[model samples]
Target: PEMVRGQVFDVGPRYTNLSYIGEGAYGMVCSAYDNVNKVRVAIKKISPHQTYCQRTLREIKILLRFRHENIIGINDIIRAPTIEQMKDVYIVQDLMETDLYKLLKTQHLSNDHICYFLYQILRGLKYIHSANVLHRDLKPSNLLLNTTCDLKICDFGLARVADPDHDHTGFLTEYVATRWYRAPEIMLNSKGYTKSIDIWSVGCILAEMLSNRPIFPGKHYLDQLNHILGILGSPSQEDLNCIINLKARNYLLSLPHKNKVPWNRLFPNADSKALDLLDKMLTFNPHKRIEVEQALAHPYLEQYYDPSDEPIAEAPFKFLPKEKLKELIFEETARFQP
Candidate 1:
């Protein structure tokens, strides 16, 4: 291995220059330009010093094994060969103009936009869940939108693969998702949860996409439960008893009032069909949450996906060659040495 340092490492000529994109707790992202194809890509760089390097590597390995149109593509990975090279571990990914969270901040999404977004999300989740993987950290920020408004689910740092025959417990961190988007089971600290947890997050995502605002914007864990109970009503004693055995049972029992809001009132002008589907998706009991396969078959999505229609975008794995992906990562590491 060569010890290439500073902003110019000799990886290849396929990748041009890169510019800064954004930063997170784990690493910073850069916009890398592919000279061969005349396209730009977003590459996330995680230094070896970062505590999340191992998790980032795990995410890359998981993503590389799957190929789907709806899932975000992990194009390449760059490894550090020395102490100087330690700063160069980069995860090269497809460059998108913006993310769903940023789009929601502008308050510009329409019902049609929501429908298209949710359809794509469900399509992606369907593939992931089918492969027995649980995307434990689904949120608006984790979803990226390409130039054509196509949605790609990204950031698999918190994702886990589920055993096909056994229930999977998700991360216990209160920070797994933004407060408003977390599933009820997660809030309650319950174990033995499954892919339904992701479904709950998807329900919240769909609601936010339609309203262009968080459905349950709570200040804290209890506040989140209050907001949820306000809309769906408190659980029955049987349901409450079942939930009480969980870790956050105190919050569930402390709510002073519980009243169900009319679902139609929430979305006054939306189609009845869409609301009907949303109702099932937001069900309180994790056991009853709509399964991903059934969600795909729901009339709401079926109305849009015509079997006779060809896919608009080719499969994501085919988007670029492996060599090109590696070149993009190397070029980005060179451009953003600092």
Candidate 2:
């Protein structure tokens, strides 16, 4: 208790910016070292985006709660004493050598890396879901990796604990996930998606490993949904309306059609084992999967790894536009009163 700083904290672990890494909707990420902790770390500065500080706590709390191998780990959180520091907050995390986005972009991942990294992410997800938490935002950038190819899921700003009433669904992420890997229900703007949403993103990630590019990169969420349908086929009124993007659902009903493509036909170049694994992952249903030996044998995946990665379609609704998402995020954070 004596160590706690009054409103402002100073003289935190001394670290210097060694290099610039990348920028995202949230902020720019860079690598540094924690002289105090005597460990390397990453810094996520919240400026230019400082007006967005309230949401930072959503990340702080979850990271503090998680200590899984596949989950990104954090070291410290220091808020800006005043409002002027562009780096309004400095969140130091274990300095991962790099993130999966950079690695995936290099186009050099082997089946070995794909299999192992994919397995690690699944292992991480199992732990996360087990804790009743959801990483609403799951994408390549948020997925960090080291030289060893060990992957850790990061970015908990949009994550949420499962509602006390529901064991499966997490809250506040309809506006989450990049368009390509986003789950269909949320793509249509529905918020009812649950733990399985991450599963769908994982499917997209697996496909990405083979092509070294996005399998369903869409310009917009609606476009993303169409791309998903283009491959998976259209759902019926009974199929989609239960839980879907209201506007997109309306658009689909107004002009409905399903361009069915066989799973095998979708990826002719993929190995038999690869194709089977990919198909089940990107399938409309999350519960779908392959055989006992093959599933366990994918490389790095351990036993009892099968679980659904889909929202089971939807009944209907909307949530968190980017502007509103900011508000929802601010509401979720525990800083500032009035």
On TM-score, the leading prediction is 1
The best candidate in terms of lDDT: 1
Residue pairs with backbone overlap in model 1? 42-95
Could you give the C-alpha RMSD of every candidate to the true structure, in order shown? Answer: 7.0, 8.4
lDDT tens readout by residue for model 1, 1-338: 22223343322344547666667545566677767557786666565422264455557656776777778876655555434345456566788888998988985676778788888888888777767677777889988898789989887767776643544333243544567877666656443237887888899888777677889998986577668888988777766666544445555677676778887899887767678878888998877779877786788887566533323223322114544444444543343333
For each candidate, the alpha-carbon lDDT, in order, equals 0.69, 0.61
| Per-residue lDDT over 75-175 for candidate 2, one digit per residue giving the tens place of the 0 to 100 score | 66555443333234556677788788888788577766777777777777767766666677778888888877778888776777655344233222346
- Runs in model 1 deviating more than 4 A are 1-13, 49-51, 81-85, 163-175, 189-193, 244-254, 306-338
lDDT of 1 at 284: 88
lDDT of 1 at 117: 88
- Please provide TM-scores, in order, for all candidate models, with all chains considered together: 0.79, 0.71
Stretches of candidate 2 off by over 4 Å are: 1-13, 24-28, 48-51, 79-87, 163-176, 187-189, 236-257, 285-338
